[model samples]
Target: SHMCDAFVGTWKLVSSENFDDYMKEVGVGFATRKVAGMAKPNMIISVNGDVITIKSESTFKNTEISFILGQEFDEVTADDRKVKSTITLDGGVLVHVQKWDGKSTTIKRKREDDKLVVECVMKGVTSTRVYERA
Candidate 1:
């Protein structure tokens, strides 16, 4: 079996580009934004059956999110706003349905070039984050 266990472990953010301007556009302040910009994030994923819990911890802050693999649920993001989301599998890829603030967003995760690539699209902005094994 080609299990999702490959994605169940901890991951570290090796690089985060393009999100700083987006975060600023969303009204994230200067000081905290600076901290967030410089911080290296650590993510821990816990999978149980169809449910997955993701915890992203950093020196500046920590965020916890949970959802089912193929079911829709409500999510409140780190910005303290609610969103509706569902997780589904496209072959071996992980896809997400995210509704943030009043806009619908879609995100996808896949292994590419020996790294985990996360692509997020919302409103008019698209952000990509790459992760490596911690």
Candidate 2:
């Protein structure tokens, strides 16, 4: 079977569901959360060998971070929130382990119904962010 490198290039966030919750979990305040929840952000990702770079850009702010597959590294959030993360492939599904100040987060991505589905879990919140081909 041929595995699709669905996550090997750049992706733009055309739309999002429960995006505000995801931002809130990251410690974003009310005003910023409101703006983030309403704004459509563009996500750019580049994967080469074992290294991956992700950039989330918007009119309000831009966030960029990079890490290697299966190696833990510090990720600085758009608002300067600090966290550690590692990406790994589990049966073709990209899984990320993120360690934040007071909690840990897990994000998983896979193809479903011709769309890339991303499920994020942190603390008491679970949000799903989906993306389409850019």
Candidate 3:
């Protein structure tokens, strides 16, 4: 549990590669895709009791999610897709999977050194976003 508490911090976006493609794969609209592409998202992650909360803040949009490990939650994605999502602690990574329309979008996040590495995958496309502690 102490190790999990290490994720409670603010992180600034550093680099994101292939996010444009990732947006397309996730069915984000053209206009929204442009906003998504241009937005530099910052993440604030925290844990309270058995629940974890993630705040995604960007110039274009803001989203917050709170969930417990191993529980299913209904989430409306940033792209406006309604999905059933779950979060799991697998090894050292926090894995988030969203299921909608019979497909799945997977995001795995982990902290390495002073940077947070996020890998988002959907429809065979993978996007890597790196963030550093703020």
lDDT of 1 by residue, 1-134 (tens): 23476687788988776777656655557886777778788878778876678788988779887876777888766655587888888988889887665667677878776688887666677678889988
Poorest 10 consecutive residues of model 1 by lDDT? 19-28
Off by over 4 Å in 2: 1-4
Question: What is the TM-score ranking, best to worst?
Answer: 3, 2, 1
Clashing pairs in 1: none
lDDT of each: 0.75, 0.73, 0.92
lDDT of 2 by residue, 57-79 (tens): 88878888777667888887665
C-alpha RMSD by candidate, in order = 2.3, 2.5, 1.0
Model 1 lDDT, residue 82, Cα: 81
**TM-score for candidate 3:** 0.96
lDDT of 3 by residue, 1-134 (tens): 56477688999899999999999898898999988888888999998888899999999879999999999999988889999999999997999999999989999999888889999999789999999988
Model 1 residue 46 distance off true place after TM-score fit, in angstroms: 2.5
Sort all candidates by lDDT, best to worst: 3, 1, 2
